[PDB]
Design a binder for this molecule. Structure first.
Ligand SMILES: CCCCC/C=C/C/C=C/C/C=C\C/C=C\CCCC(=O)O[C@H](COC(=O)CCCCCCCCCCCCCCCCC)COP(=O)(O)O[C@@H]1[C@H](O)[C@H](O)[C@@H](OP(=O)(O)O)[C@H](OP(=O)(O)O)[C@H]1O
Ligand SMILES: CCCCCCCCCCCCCCCCCC(=O)OC[C@H](COP(=O)(O)OCCN)OC(=O)CCCCCCCCCCCCCCCCC
Ligand SMILES: CC(C)CCC[C@@H](C)[C@H]1CC[C@H]2[C@@H]3CC=C4C[C@@H](OC(=O)CCC(=O)O)CC[C@]4(C)[C@H]3CC[C@]12C
Ligand SMILES: CC(C)CCC[C@@H](C)[C@H]1CC[C@H]2[C@@H]3CC=C4C[C@@H](OC(=O)CCC(=O)O)CC[C@]4(C)[C@H]3CC[C@]12C
Ligand SMILES: CC(C)CCC[C@@H](C)[C@H]1CC[C@H]2[C@@H]3CC=C4C[C@@H](OC(=O)CCC(=O)O)CC[C@]4(C)[C@H]3CC[C@]12C
Ligand SMILES: CC(C)CCC[C@@H](C)[C@H]1CC[C@H]2[C@@H]3CC=C4C[C@@H](O)CC[C@]4(C)[C@H]3CC[C@]12C
Ligand SMILES: CC(C)CCC[C@@H](C)[C@H]1CC[C@H]2[C@@H]3CC=C4C[C@@H](O)CC[C@]4(C)[C@H]3CC[C@]12C
Ligand SMILES: CC(C)CCC[C@@H](C)[C@H]1CC[C@H]2[C@@H]3CC=C4C[C@@H](O)CC[C@]4(C)[C@H]3CC[C@]12C
Ligand SMILES: CC(C)CCC[C@@H](C)[C@H]1CC[C@H]2[C@@H]3CC=C4C[C@@H](O)CC[C@]4(C)[C@H]3CC[C@]12C
Ligand SMILES: CC(C)CCC[C@@H](C)[C@H]1CC[C@H]2[C@@H]3CC=C4C[C@@H](O)CC[C@]4(C)[C@H]3CC[C@]12C
Ligand SMILES: *[C@@H]1O[C@H](CO)[C@@H](O)[C@H](O)[C@H]1NC(C)=O
Ligand SMILES: [Ca+2]
Ligand SMILES: [Ca+2]
Length: 1371
C-alpha cells in the first residue's frame, strides 16, 4: 500500500547494524529491571521506563521504511509479522492508558527474538531445529492420548480421596504441621488415639495435586510422566486406600508414559538425523571436509621431508657456527621420544599433586605443595622456552598444541599473583595441564577415531556456537516472561523461595532449573500459590507445562543432533582414510613390480547404521581314564543340565522369601534346610566338572573359563560359612553374615547355560568396548571439574543449626526454635552439609549426584551461600558460582551423555543373521518380497445365503453411516467418563449413570448386529471383535447386579484406542515398536536380573534398618527409610530400586542406608549398629548399570525398526504394500484370489506411486510399467494376487529388471535361486506361484497392454498417415 514507485529509497548496510544495536540495548534495558511487591518501584525503574519511547520510535521508523520500500511484501515474511505485532502492541500501551494496558507490557518479552530476524545466519540454524521436530508432533499425539486415558482411570479410582486427614478429636484443627491422608479402616492409615478422620482437608501440596476434575487429573498425570514427584502420590494414595493395588496404576504409568515415549523420541529423531546426513547439500560439505583432510596428511609428510634435508645443509652466527647448531641440537631433542615421554611424566606428577589437597591436610603437606607448584610451574615455563628457541618463535606458536600450553602457563601466573592481591580464592587453573594426558591415545590404535571427532567438531564450530546462542535466547525470553507473570509475587509469609523471578539473574537460574526438569513441580506450586491459589491461579500452570515440555525435547534435539552428526562424520572420515591407505599400498606394491620387472583380525561387516546409510546414498544417487568317560557322560545328559537349571531357579526364589528383619523367623529356619541341599547340588556339579576337565592349565582348564571361577566362589563361600558356624554357632556373626551375601550370584549362573541369554550379555559387553575410549575422556574431564570444585568449596560447606552463629565456638549450647505458636529449645550443632567438596573423592560423588540431576538445586544453594573456610553460610554471598553449575550441565549431562547415546546408535551391530553379504540383494528388497511370499486377500464375506436379508444387513454393517455412527458414540462415550467431578449433585451423578445405560445398550447392538452379519465364527477371529465383546459383556454384567465395583468398565475407556486406526502414521509407528519389544524378550530379561540381584543384596545388607524411629525433630531428608520406602520385603525392595531408577531422591536414600542407624525392635541387635558403608557403591553402581542396560534396550528396539524410521515415501517400502491389500479386497469383494485384468488397470490408477500408477501418470508411460510386469495372463482374464503383487515391487525397486530377450530368461532363473538361497523353506509350487516358470507360450501382462500402447502410437500416426497424403493430394 504505497504510491507505486516514486523515489522509493532502500537500505544500506549500517542501517541494519544500527537496528541490531538498538535491539541489544533494549534487551539490556529489559534485563536491568527489578520487580517489587505491591506497587513499589526502585529508583532506577523510572529511568529505565522512560527509555521506552525512544526504542519504540526507532522500531516504528524502521518498520515504516521497510513497509514503504516493500509496499506491504512486508507481511509476507514471518519475521516481519512478528516485528509488526511487537510495534503494534507497544504503541497501544505507550500511547494512551484509558483501557487496561498493564497486560500488553508482557509482549515486550518477544523483542530479544528480533535478533534472529536481523541476523540471517541465525534463521538458517533455527530452520534446522524446527525441521527435526515436525515428526515429533505425532509422538505428542500419542503422549496426549496416553495422558488422557490414564487421567480417566485415575479419575475413577482416586476422585476426592485425599481430602480427609487426622483432625483433633475436640476441635476442627489439624493435629500436626505436616498432615497426611488418613483412613477409617485398617488397610488405610489410621489416626492415633487423640485424633479422628474428619471429612474436609485441602489436600496434598495445598490442594494443587489431586484427582478431582479431568483437568486436575490430566495435570496430575503429566507431572508423573516427567517422573517428578510421582512417588509422593504413590505414598499418599497408599495412605488413603492401602498399598495392595496402587502400584498397578503408577508403575505402568511411568513405563508407558515416560520410558516408552522416550524410546520413540530417540527412534524418530535418530531416523531423521540419518536422512539429513545424506542430503545433497550436507554431503557436499562432508566431501569438502574429506578432501581438505587428505591435503593436510600429504602436506605434513612433505614438510618433514624438506625439514630433514634443510638440516643436512646445515653443517654471532658466523663465529658461533655452533649457535646455529644448538638451535639444531635442541630441535633434535624436542623431537626425541625421551623428551616427549619425560615431560608427559611430569604432567602426571603435577596432576597427582593438585588432587592430594583436602580440607584438613597436615601443615607439612601444605608447605610441600606450596613449593611444588612453583617447581612444576618453572619446569613447564622452561619447557616452553626450549621449544620456542629450539623450533623458532613462528613454528612454535603456530602449533595448536603449544598455544594451549601457553594459555595454562599464562593462567597459572595469573592465579599466583591473584592469590597475593586477594587471598581466599584459588581456582586451581594448573589442573588444565592434565588435558595433555589425552595425547597418550596416539600410541594406541584409537587415535584415528578420537582425532577425527575433534576435527569434525572444529569444522562445525560456527554451527555449534549458533545453536547454543539460539538455545540461550529462548531461555532469556522465558526468563523475561517469568518476571512479568511472577514479579514481586513470591514474597510469601514464610519467606521468599530461593527460586524466584524477582531479578534477571534469579529468573535465568529458575528457568534453567525447569529446563533440567528438577523440582519443576515445586516451582509450579509457588507460581500457582502466588496468583491467588488453587482457586484462582490454576491457569498459570501453562507457563510451567510449556517450558518443561518444550525444554525437555528442545535440549534433546539440539545436543543429540550435534552428537550424531559429528560422530557419524568421524566414523566415515576414519573409515575412508583406512581404505584409502590400504588401496594406495596395494597400488604402490603393483608399481613396485614394474621397477623390479627388469630382473623378474576381521573387521565386523559395517553396522546397522552404516549399512542403511550406504543404501540411502545409493538410492539417492541412483535417482540423482574309565571314570572320566563316565563324568563326561552325565554332563552330556540333557536331563542333567535341565535339572541343574531348575535347581538354580529354585535357589533364586529361596533368596527372595527370606525374612531380613527377623533372623530367627520360622520361615528362615525352614529355608535354612533348603540352603544345605542347593549347595550340595552345586558341590557335586563342581567336582565332576573338575574331574571331566583339568585343574591344571592344559588349555582346557576348568579354572580357565571365567564363569567357572564365579561358580567356584559361590560354592566355596557356602562351604566356608558352614565351617565357621560349625565350630561355634555365634562366635563370629559378622563374617558369616558377609559370606551369606555371596549367594546372590546364583542367578548369574543362568547366563552361561542359556544360549540366547549369553548372546544378549555379549552384546552389552560389546557396547562397553566401543564407548570405553570416550568413557576415559569422560572421567578425565570430570576429574578436572572435581579438582576445581575442591579448590572453590573446600571447608566452606559448614553450618550451624542456629542461623545467627557463624563459627564453631559460637555454635554451642541451646537455642530457641520458633515454630508456629510454639517455642522449643534445641541444641546447637556445628555440622557439615550432606554433599560437599572436601576432597577429590567427595567432589566426584557430589558431581555425580548433579549429573543424575537430583538434588542439585540444594547443592547450588550451598555453593552460592559459602563464605570462607571454617565459617558459616551467608545467603547470596557468591552468586557468580552459578556459572560453575551451568557450565557443568552443558558439558556432561547435555553433551557427553548424548555422545554416549549417539556412539551406541552408530556402532550397533546386527542381531546374528549369519554373514549377510553373500546374498547380492539384501537391503529392503527382502522385506517387500518376504511379504509377497506370505500374503492373503482380506476375505469379505459376500455370503448370498439370503440376498434380501442377510447380505443386506451385512452391507449396513460395512456401510459408512454405521462406521461414523460408531466413532461418534465412542467420542461421546468418552466425554461421559470425563464429566465426573468432586462434589457433584446426586442428580448429576444419576444423570451420568443414566447415559452409561444408554451407551452400553447401543454398544451391545453393534456386537449383536456384527455377529449376525459376519457370522458366529468369522466375527470371533478378529482381535478387536473379542476386545469389543469382552467390553460389552463386562459392562452389562455390573448393571444387572446393581438392580438385582465396576472397574472393568474401564475396558470401555479403552475404546478410545479404536480411534487410532483412522490415523495411519501413528498406528504403524505404535505397532512396529510393540512388535520389536516382542522380538527382544531376553534383553528385557537381563534388566530383570539386574533388579533381582540388587534387590536381594539390599534385603540382606540394608534390611535390618529400623523404620519405627520418629521424633519431633522430623529431619525428613535424614530419614528416607520409612514404612513406604524400605528393604524389608522382596517387593518393598523392588519399589525402592524402581524409585531410584526414576531418580526420586535416590541420593537421600543412599545416605539413609549408611552406618550407625537404629536397628529394628525384632532385628536381634540392641545397639545402633545397622546400615553399611557399602551404600555408596550399592547406589552409585546401580544408577550406572540401570541407565546402561536400559539404553541398550532402547537402541536394540530402535535399530530393529531402522528401515522404517529412515523410510522415504518416494521409494517403495513394506508399509506401502498394505495399501495394495485393502484395494484388492474391494475390487475383488469376495476375495476369490482371482481378479480379471480390466479391474487391474483401474487398480493401478487408484494407487499412488511407487506401488501404483497414480492418477496423473501418462497413459503411455503407464503402459511401459505394464510391460515391465512381464507376467503370464490367465485366459479367464484373471491375474493372481501373489503373482501380481510381486511384479509391482520389482518394477518400482528395479530388482534386477532385465534389459529383455535372453536376460529375462536368466533373471527368472537367477531371482528364483536367490529366493531359494534366502529361504529353502518356501514351497517350490508356491515359489513358482509367486514367480511363474518362464513360458513364452503364455502371453505376458505386457502383451495385452502392448496391443494398445504400440498401436495407439501408430493409431494417432494412422490418422496422420492418411493425412500425410491427403493434404499432399489436395495440394
Ligand atoms: C558443545 C557443547 C559443549 C562442548 C564442550 C564440551 C566438551 C569439549 C569437547 C569434548 C569432546 C572431546 C572429545 C574427545 C577429545 C579429545 C580426545 C583426544 C583428544 C585429541 O584427539 O587430541 C587433540 C587435542 O589435543 C589435546 O591435547 C587435548 C586438548 C583438548 C581438546 C579437546 C576438545 C576440543 C573440541 C572442541 C570443542 C567442541 C565444541 C585433537 O587433535 P587435533 O584436532 O589438534 O588434530 C591434530 C592436528 O590434525 C595436527 O595435524 C596434529 O597435531 P600437532 O601437529 O601436534 O598440532 C595431529 O594430527 P596427526 O596425529 O594425524 O599427525 C592432531 O593431534
Ligand atoms: C520380578 C523380578 C524383577 C522384575 C523387575 C523388572 C522391572 C522392574 C520394575 C519393578 C516393579 C516394581 C514392582 C513393585 C511390586 C509391588 C511393590 C509394592 O509396594 O508392594 C505393595 C504390596 C504390599 O505387599 P508388601 O508390601 O510386600 O507386604 C504386605 C504389607 N506390607 O505388595 C503386593 O501386594 C504386590 C504383590 C505382587 C507384586 C508383583 C506380582
Ligand atoms: C589420577 C589419580 C589416580 C590420582 C590418585 C587418586 C587421588 C585423587 C586420591 C586417591 C585416594 C585419595 C586419598 C584418600 C584419603 C585421604 C585421607 C585424608 O586424610 C584425612 O582424612 C585426615 C588427615 C589428617 O588429619 O592427618 C587426606 C586426603 C587423602 C590422602 C585422599 C587424597 C586424594 C587421593 C590420594
Ligand atoms: C517375581 C518372581 C521372582 C517370583 C516372586 C518371588 C517373591 C516376590 C515371592 C515368592 C514367594 C513369596 C512369599 C511366599 C509366602 C509368604 C508368607 C506370607 O506370610 C506371612 O505374612 C509371613 C509368615 C508368618 O507370619 O509366619 C508373607 C509373604 C511371603 C513371605 C511371600 C512374599 C513374596 C514372595 C517371596
Ligand atoms: C544454556 C546456557 C548457555 C545458558 C545458561 C545461562 C547463563 C548465561 C546464566 C544462568 C545463571 C546466570 C548467573 C546467575 C547469577 C549471577 C550472579 C550475579 O552477579 C552478582 O554478583 C550479582 C549479585 C546478587 O545477585 O546478589 C549476576 C551474574 C551471574 C553469575 C549470572 C551470569 C549468567 C548466568 C550464568
Ligand atoms: C523351593 C522354592 C519354591 C522356595 C519356596 C519356599 C516357600 C514357597 C515356602 C518354603 C518355606 C515356607 C514357609 C515356612 C514357614 C512358614 C511359617 C508358617 O508358620 C507359615 C508358613 C510359612 C511362612 C511358609 C510359607 C511358604 C514358604 C516360604
Ligand atoms: C549414568 C549417569 C551418567 C547418569 C544417569 C543418567 C540420567 C539419570 C541423567 C543423565 C543425563 C540426564 C539427562 C540428560 C539430558 C537431559 C536434557 C533434557 O532433555 C532434560 C534433562 C535431561 C533429561 C537430563 C536428566 C537426567 C539424566 C537422564
Ligand atoms: C572445560 C574444562 C576446561 C573445565 C574448566 C572450566 C571451569 C572449571 C571454569 C570455567 C569458568 C569458571 C568460573 C568463572 C568465574 C568464576 C567466578 C569466581 O569468582 C569464582 C570461580 C568461578 C565460578 C569459575 C569456576 C571455574 C569455572 C567454572
Ligand atoms: C472434547 C471437549 C470439548 C470436552 C472436554 C471438556 C470437559 C470434559 C471438561 C472441561 C471443563 C470441565 C469442567 C470445568 C469446571 C468444573 C467446575 C467444577 O466445580 C466441577 C467440574 C467442572 C464442571 C468440569 C467438568 C469437566 C469439564 C466440563
Ligand atoms: C565390588 C565391591 C565389593 C568392591 C568395593 C569395595 C569398597 C568400595 C567397599 C565394599 C565393602 C565395603 C566395606 C563393607 C563393610 C564395612 C563395615 C563398616 O562398619 C565400615 C566400612 C566397611 C569396612 C566397608 C568399607 C567400604 C568397602 C570396602
Ligand atoms: C489408644 O487406642 C487403643 C485402641 O483400642 C486403646 O487400646 C488404647 O487404650 C488407647 N490409648 C489411650 C491412652 O487411650
Ligand atoms: Ca527428580
Ligand atoms: Ca530427573
Amino acid at each position: 500500500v504505497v504510491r507505486k514507485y516514486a523515489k522509493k529509497i532502500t537500505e544500506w548496510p549500517p542501517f541494519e547494524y544500527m537496528i541490531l544495536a538498538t535491539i541489544i540495548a533494549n534487551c539490556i534495558v529489559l534485563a536491568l529491571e527489578q520487580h517489587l511487591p505491591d506497587d513499589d518501584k526502585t529508583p532506577m525503574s523510572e529511568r529505565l521506563d522512560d527509555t521506552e519511547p525512544y526504542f519504540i520510535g526507532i522500531f516504528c521508523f524502521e518498520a515504516g521504511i521497510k513497509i514503504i520500500a516493500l509496499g506491504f511484501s512486508y507481511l509476507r515474511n514471518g519475521w516481519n509479522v512478528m516485528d509488526f505485532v511487537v510495534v503494534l502492541t507497544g504503541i497501544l500501551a505507550t500511547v494512551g492508558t484509558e483501557f487496561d494496558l498493564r497486560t500488553l507490557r508482557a509482549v515486550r518479552v518477544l523483542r530479544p527474538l528480533k535478533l534472529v530476524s536481523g541476523i540471517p545466519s541465525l534463521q538458517v540454524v533455527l530452520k534446522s531445529i524446527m525441521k527435526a521436530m515436525i515428526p515429533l508432533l505425532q509422538i505428542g499425539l500419542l503422549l496426549f492420548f496416553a495422558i488422557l486415558i490414564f487421567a480417566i482411570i485415575g479419575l475413577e479410582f482416586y476422585m476426592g480421596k485425599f481430602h480427609t486427614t487426622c483432625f483433633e478429636e475436640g476441635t476442627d484443627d489439624i493435629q500436626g504441621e505436616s498432615p497426611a491422608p488418613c483412613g477409617t479402616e485398617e488397610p488405610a492409615r489410621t489416626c492415633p488415639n487423640g485424633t479422628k478422620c474428619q471429612p474436609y482437608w485441602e489436600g496434598p501440596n495445598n490442594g494443587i495435586t489431586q484427582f478431582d476434575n479431568i483437568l486436575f487429573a490430566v495435570l496430575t498425570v503429566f507431572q508423573c510422566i516427567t517422573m517428578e514427584g510421582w512417588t509422593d502420590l504413590l505414598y499418599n494414595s497408599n495412605d488413603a486406600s492401602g498399598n495392595t493395588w496402587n502400584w498397578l496404576y503408577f508403575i505402568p504409568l511411568i513405563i508407558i508414559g515416560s520410558f516408552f515415549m522416550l524410546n520413540l523420541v530417540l527412534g524418530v529423531l535418530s531416523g531423521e538425523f540419518a536422512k539429513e546426513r545424506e542430503r545433497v547439500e550436507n554431503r557436499r560439505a562432508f566431501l569438502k571436509l574429506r578432501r581438505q583432510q587428505q591435503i593436510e596428511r600429504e602436506l605434513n609428510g612433505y614438510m618433514e621431508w624438506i625439514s630433514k634435508a634443510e638440516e643436512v645443509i646445515l653443517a654471532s652466527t658466523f663465529f658461533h657456527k655452533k649457535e646455529r647448531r644448538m638451535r639444531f641440537y635442541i630441535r633434535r631433542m624436542v623431537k626425541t621420544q625421551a623428551f616427549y615421554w619425560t615431560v608427559l611424566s611430569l604432567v602426571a606428577l603435577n596432576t597427582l599433586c593438585v588432587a592430594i589437597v583436602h580440607y584438613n591436610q597436615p601443615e607439612w603437606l601444605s608447605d610441600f605443595l606450596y613449593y611444588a607448584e612453583f617447581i612444576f610451574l618453572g619446569l613447564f615455563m622452561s619447557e616452553m622456552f626450549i621449544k620456542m628457541y629450539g623450533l623458532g618463535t613462528r613454528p612454535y606458536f603456530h602449533s595448536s598444541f603449544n598455544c594451549f600450553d601457553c594459555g595454562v602457563i599464562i593462567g597459572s601466573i595469573f592465579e599466583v599473583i591473584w592469590a597475593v592481591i586477594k587471598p581466599g580464592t584459588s581456582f586451581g587453573i594448573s589442573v588444565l595441564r592434565a588435558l595433555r594426558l589425552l595425547r597418550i591415545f596416539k600410541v594406541t590404535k584409537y587415535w584415528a577415531s578420537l582425532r577425527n571427532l575433534v576435527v569434525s567438531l572444529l569444522n562445525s564450530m560456527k554451527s555449534i556456537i549458533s545453536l547454543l546462542f539460539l538455545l540461550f535466547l529462548f531461555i532469556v525470553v522465558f526468563a523475561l516472561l517469568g518476571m512479568q507473570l511472577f514479579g514481586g509475587q513470591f514474597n510469601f509469609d514464610e519467606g521468599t523461595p530461593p527460586t524466584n523471578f524477582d531479578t534477571f539473574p534469579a529468573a535465568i537460574m529458575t528457568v534453567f532449573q525447569i529446563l533440567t526438569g528438577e523440582d519443576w513441580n515445586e516451582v509450579m506450586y509457588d507460581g500457582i500459590k502466588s496468583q491467588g491459589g488453587v482457586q484462582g491461579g490454576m491457569v498459570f500452570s501453562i507457563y510451567f507445562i510449556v517450558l518443561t515440555l518444550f525444554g525437555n525435547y528442545t535440549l534433546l534435539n539440539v545436543f543429540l543432533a550435534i552428537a550424531v552428526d559429528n560422530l557419524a562424520n568421524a566414523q566415515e572420515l576414519t573409515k575412508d582414510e583406512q581404505e584409502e591407505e590400504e588401496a594406495a599400498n596395494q597400488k604402490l606394491a603393483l608399481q613396485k613390480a614394474k621397477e623390479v620387472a627388469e630382473v623378474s583380525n576381521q573387521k565386523p561387516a559395517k553396522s546397522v547404521w552404516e549399512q542403511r546409510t550406504s543404501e540411502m546414498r545409493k538410492q539417492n544417487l541412483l535417482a540423482s581314564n574309565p571314570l572320566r568317560r563316565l563324568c563326561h557322560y552325565i554332563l552330556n545328559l540333557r536331563y542333567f543340565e535341565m535339572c541343574i537349571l531348575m535347581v538354580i531357579a529354585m535357589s533364586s526364589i529361596a533368596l527372595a522369601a527370606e525374612d531380613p528383619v527377623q533372623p530367627n523367623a520360622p520361615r528362615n529356619n525352614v529355608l535354612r534346610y533348603f540352603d544345605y541341599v542347593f549347595t550340595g547340588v552345586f558341590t557335586f556339579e563342581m567336582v565332576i566338572k573338575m574331574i571331566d576337565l583339568g585343574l591344571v592349565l592344559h588349555q582346557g582348564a576348568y579354572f580357565r573359563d571365567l564363569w567357572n571361577i564365579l561358580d567356584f566362589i559361590v560354592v566355596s563361600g557356602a562351604l566356608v560359612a558352614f565351617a565357621f558356624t560349625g565350630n561355634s554357632k555365634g562366635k563370629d556373626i559378622n563374617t558369616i553374615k558377609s559370606l551369606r551375601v555371596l549367594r546372590v550370584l546364583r542367578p548369574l549362573k543362568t547366563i552361561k547355560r542359556l544360549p540366547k541369554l549369553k548372546a544378549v550379555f555379549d552384546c552389552v559387553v560389546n557396547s562397553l568396548k566401543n564407548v570405553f575410549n570416550i568413557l576415559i575422556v569422560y572421567m578425565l574431564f570430570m576429574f578436572i571439574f572435581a579438582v576445581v570444585a575442591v579448590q572453590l568449596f573446600k571447608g566452606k560447606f559448614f553450618h550451624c543449626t542456629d542461623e545467627s552463629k557463624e563459627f564453631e565456638k559460637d555454635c554451642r549450647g541451646k537455642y530457641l526454635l520458633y515454630e508456629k505458636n510454639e517455642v522449643k529449645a534445641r541444641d546447637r550443632e556445628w555440622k557439615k552439609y550432606e554433599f560437599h567438596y572436601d576432597n577429590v573423592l567427595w567432589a566426584l560423588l557430589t558431581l555425580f549426584t548433579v549429573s543424575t540431576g537430583e538434588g542439585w538445586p540444594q547443592v547450588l544453594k550451598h555453593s552460592v551461600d559459602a563464605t570462607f573456610e571454617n565459617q558459616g553460610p551467608s545467603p547470596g554471598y557468591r552468586m557468580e558460582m552459578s556459572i560453575f553449575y551451568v557450565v557443568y550441565f552443558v558439558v556432561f549431562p547435555f553433551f557427553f551423555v548424548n555422545i554416549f547415546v549417539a556412539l551406541i546408535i552408530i556402532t550397533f551391530q546386527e542381531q546374528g543373521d549369519k554373514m549377510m553379504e553373500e546374498y547380492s540383494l539384501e537391503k529392503n528388497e527382502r522385506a517387500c518380497i518376504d511379504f509377497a511370499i506370505s500374503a492373503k486377500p482380506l476375505t469379505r464375506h459376500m455370503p448370498q445365503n439370503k440376498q434380501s436379508f442377510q447380505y443386506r444387513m451385512w452391507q449396513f454393517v460395512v456401510s459408512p453411516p454405521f462406521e461414523y455412527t460408531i466413532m461418534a458414540m465412542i467420542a461421546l462415550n468418552t466425554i461421559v467418563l470425563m464429566m465426573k467431578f468432586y462434589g457433584a449433585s446426586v442428580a448429576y451423578e444419576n444423570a451420568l449413570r443414566v447415559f452409561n445405560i444408554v451407551f452400553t445398550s447401543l454398544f451391545s447392538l453393534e456386537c449383536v448386529l456384527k455377529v449376525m452379519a459376519f457370522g458366529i465364527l468369522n466375527y470371533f477371529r478378529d482381535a478387536w471383535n473379542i476386545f469389543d465383546f469382552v467390553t460389552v459383556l463386562g459392562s452389562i454384567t455390573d448393571i444387572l447386579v446393581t438392580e438385582f465395583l465396576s472397574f472393568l468398565r474401564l475396558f470401555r475407556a479403552a475404546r478410545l484406542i479404536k480411534l487410532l486406526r483412522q490415523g495411519y502414521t501413528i498406528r504403524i509407528l505404535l505397532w512396529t515398536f510393540v512388535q520389536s519389544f516382542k522380538a527382544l524378550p531376553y534383553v528385557c530379561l537381563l534388566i530383570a536380573m539386574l533388579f533381582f540381584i540388587y534387590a536381594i543384596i539390599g534385603m540382606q545388607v540394608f534390611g535390618n534398618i529400623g523404620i519405627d524411629v520418629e521424633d519431633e525433630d522430623s529431619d525428613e531428608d535424614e530419614f528416607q527409610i520409612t514404612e513406604h520406602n524400605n528393604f524389608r520385603t522382596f517387593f518393598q525392595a523392588l519399589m525402592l530400586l524402581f524409585r531410584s531408577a526414576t531418580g526420586e531422591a535416590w541420593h537421600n536414600i543412599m545416605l539413609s542406608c549408611l552406618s550407625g542407624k537404629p536397628c529394628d525392635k525384632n532385628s536381634g541387635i540392641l545397639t545402633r549398629e545397622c546400615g553399611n558403608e557399602f551404600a555408596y557403591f550399592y547406589f552409585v553402581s546401580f544408577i550406572f548399570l540401570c541407565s546402561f542396560l536400559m539404553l541398550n534396550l532402547f537402541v536394540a528396539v530402535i535399530m530393529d525398526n531402522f528401515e522404517y524410521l529412515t523410510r522415504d515415501s518416494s521409494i517403495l517400502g513394506p508399509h506401502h504394500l498394505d495399501e495394495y491389500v485393502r484395494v484388492w479386497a474391494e475390487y475383488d469383494p469376495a476375495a476369490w484370489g482371482r481378479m480379471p485384468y480390466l479391474d487391474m488397470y483401474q487398480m493401478l490408477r487408484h494407487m499412488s506411486p511407487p506401488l501404483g500408477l497414480g492418477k496423473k501418470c501418462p497413459a503411455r508411460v503407464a503402459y511401459k510399467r505394464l510391460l515391465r510386469m512381464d507376467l503370464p495372463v490367465a485366459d479367464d482374464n484373471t491375474v493372481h494376487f501373489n503373482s501380481t503383487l510381486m511384479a509391482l515391487i520389482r518394477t518400482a525397486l528395479d530388482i534386477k529388471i532385465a534389459k529383455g530377450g535372453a536376460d529375462k530368461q536368466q533373471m527368472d532363473a537367477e531371482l528364483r535361486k536367490e529366493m531359494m538361497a534366502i529361504w529353502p523353506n518356501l514351497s517350490q509350487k508356491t515359489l513358482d506361484l509367486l514367480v511363474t516358470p518362464h513360458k513364452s507360450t503364455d502371453l505376458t501382462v505386457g502383451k495385452i497392454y502392448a496391443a494398445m500402447m504400440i498401436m495407439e502410437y501408430y493409431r494417432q500416426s494412422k490418422a496422420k498417415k492418411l493425412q500425410a497424403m491427403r493434404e499432399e493430394q489436395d495440394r
